[PDB]
């Protein structure tokens, strides 16, 4: 629930070639882009800064710039001891989540080769067992550097909650707006003779939660597969609900859409 987090992806090809990308997301709307060439931060929304002053924004930007510059070099330095096999990928995600009831929880997680590597709780080692031996090794070394751990703890449990509250309050207008969902119907080639598929597309809605059901009057017809809620530029969502049925029973069927933006005025599409 409204978990602001920054993410980083580093790809190491050879002993001297490595790329790094980063971005800060509110929930799934990208807020901060990162030009790693010049090491600058792009604020993609007017309220990307929250209530933070520009000075602390510059401080945070410089901290992230130095970290981005140095991460690849340090990983290359230690890959010999850690027996990394090239090429490989290192992913990281760190941020703070606002649970319902005003309980902000901070988190940090890392992964190598798509497998979990480590995490922090109360600013400490948690080597995930998937990372195996080396995992523990790494974080053990990381324990030694007190300054890095202090910076991580400060950014996690002292700055992230402040920033999250700031953006949630500042971006109030954009966060809690409502847009009516468009909807339409289409046919689909289904397996089996004397068979058909009905697809109810609902698009352009926000916020994400939505209830779409293929119903025969009020019979509450089952067998409705709801595909994953695909994203869509302009910051709305799209979703197709499919139903398989033999030909002939198509009459008396309708897809019903309930969303917060409709304030109880449900959408009914007859077929």
């Amino acid at each position, epitope marked *: 629930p409204t978990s602001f987090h920054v993410i980083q992806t580093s790809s190491f090809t050879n002993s001297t070639w490595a790329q790094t990308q980063g971005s800060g997301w509110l929930d799934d709307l990208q807020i901060h882009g990162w030009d790693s060439d010049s090491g600058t931060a792009i604020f993609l929304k007017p309220w990307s800064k929250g209530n933070f002053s520009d000075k602390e924004v510059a401080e945070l930007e410089e901290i992230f710039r130095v970290y981005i*510059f140095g991460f690849a070099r340090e990983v290359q330095d230690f890959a010999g001891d850690f027996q990394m096999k090239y090429p490989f990928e290192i992913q990281g995600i760190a941020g703070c989540e606002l649970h319902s009831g005003g309980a902000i929880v901070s988190f940090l997680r890392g992964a190598l080769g798509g497998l979990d590597f480590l995490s922090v709780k109360n600013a400490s080692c948690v080597p995930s067992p998937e990372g195996g031996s080396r995992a523990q090794k790494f974080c053990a070394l990381i324990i030694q550097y007190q300054g890095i751990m202090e910076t991580v703890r400060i950014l996690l449990y002292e700055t992230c909650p402040r920033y999250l509250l700031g953006v949630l309050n500042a971006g109030k207008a954009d966060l809690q707006r409502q847009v009516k969902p468009e909807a339409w119907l289409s046919s689909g080639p289904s397996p089996g003779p004397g068979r058909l598929q009905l697809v109810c597309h609902v698009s352009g809605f926000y916020p994400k939660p939505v209830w779409v059901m293929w119903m025969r009057g009020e019979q509450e017809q089952q067998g409705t597969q709801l595909g994953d809620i695909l994203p869509n530029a302009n910051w709305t969502w799209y979703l197709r609900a499919t139903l398989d049925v033999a030909d002939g029973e198509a009459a008396g069927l309708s897809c019903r859409v309930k969303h917060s933006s409709l304030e109880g005025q449900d959408i009914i599409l007859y077929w």
Partner: T-cell receptor
Amino acid sequence: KITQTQPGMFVQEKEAVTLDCTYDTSDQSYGLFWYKQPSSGEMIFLIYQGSYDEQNATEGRYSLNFQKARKSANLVISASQLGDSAMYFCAMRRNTGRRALTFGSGTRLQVQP
Amino acid sequence: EVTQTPKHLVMGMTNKKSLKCEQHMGHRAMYWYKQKAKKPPELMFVYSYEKLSINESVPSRFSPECPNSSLLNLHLHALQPEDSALYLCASSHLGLAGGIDGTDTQYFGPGTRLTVLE
């Protein structure tokens, strides 16, 4: 910012002088440095005290009077010699700061024989 | 130690000169400081991992450059009389290489007394 608030200090030879340096940063987890610049110009590192080190760092003839609560850490030179006549700066580096030193106004010290 | 040749420099308003700072301790980060008359040093540039990380609104006449990892030049051209001061180069460790002690002390070099003249 760091305020030395001292025009210049004078002290007889073979005595102790307490150079003052008061900072105003409310953030914890920082690092306090002292640098000496003789008349030639080069800056010579003197001593360093971490914020959390819970101990007044001592090195050679230079001691420290770091009081975190009062936001002051006065460098203490014991048994001052004639070579200790130089510019003295009190820089501070923060954990979430500029990643580079930030010097105060500095205080001239002129030990006399 | 850090070497900062040339130790002295007298320049006109159209000449082009260069300042070379070189350290062989292989620290990581390098800095450029400018100190005026009877003033604390002021930061100018910071190079972390041979990449410029801080530019404190320095005008475009100064053109820093870090070719190697143990070298940091500074090219000047068409300066102005107010740009006469003492320029110091500093070096310091960075993370994961300075060891357990995360002091990151800065070691300065013998500054260059640049006095420009119209």
